[PDB]
DNA sequence: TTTTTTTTTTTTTT
């Protein structure tokens, strides 16, 4: 929506890689407008010049999600 | 975009819960237009009457993502 | 080869 949305990287979680479009797929915990810190997984430009839209994962989600996912690899 | 997008549930992976909006947060592998089967995490209506937008996770992503995330809870 | 959102969306043949 806005040209530059306010944010801040609280903690880097997982980094996957770039795609054919250069989409840097990563999962990091950032603060929404430098207020609420939460986990959000998105992909950005290869040159890190811009960002895109993905999905936000709350503690409730990440908790149950990781619990099951981690156990799925068992 | 469309009123009803074509799809098919190949395999259910993880089910989180509903939210204050009734958003049923789940992660299941479905076939895009009943063609390409891929993992996609989204939230639907409480009464499962409609669906919404989320994010699609490819094998490359889910693979590295799971590996790291699973190890993160170790 | 999307141009990111301070928690009641109406889903897309990579």
UniProtKB/TrEMBL annotation, chains A, B:
BP terms from Gene Ontology: regulation of DNA-templated transcription
Domain annotation Transcriptional coactivator p15 (PC4) C-terminal: ranges: 21-67
Entries under InterPro entries matching the protein: PC4-like, PC4_C
Domain of life according to the entry: Bacteria
Gene3D superfamilies found in the cross-reference section: 2.30.31.70
MF GO annotations: DNA binding
Any single Pfam family the record assigns to this protein: PC4
Protein name: Transcriptional coactivator p15 (PC4) C-terminal domain-containing protein
Provenance organism: Lactococcus lactis subsp. lactis (strain IL1403) (Streptococcus lactis)
Phylogenetic classification of the source organism: Bacteria, Bacillati, Bacillota, Bacilli, Lactobacillales
């Amino acid at each position: 929506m806005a040209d530059k949305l306010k944010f801040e990287i609280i903690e880097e979680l997982i980094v996957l890689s770039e795609n054919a479009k250069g989409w840097r797929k990563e999962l990091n915990r950032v603060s929404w407008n430098d207020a609420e810190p939460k986990y959000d997984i998105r992909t950005w430009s290869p040159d890190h010049e811009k960002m895109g839209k993905g999905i936000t994962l709350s503690e409730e989600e990440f908790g149950v999600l990781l619990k099951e996912l981690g156990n799925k690899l068992e």
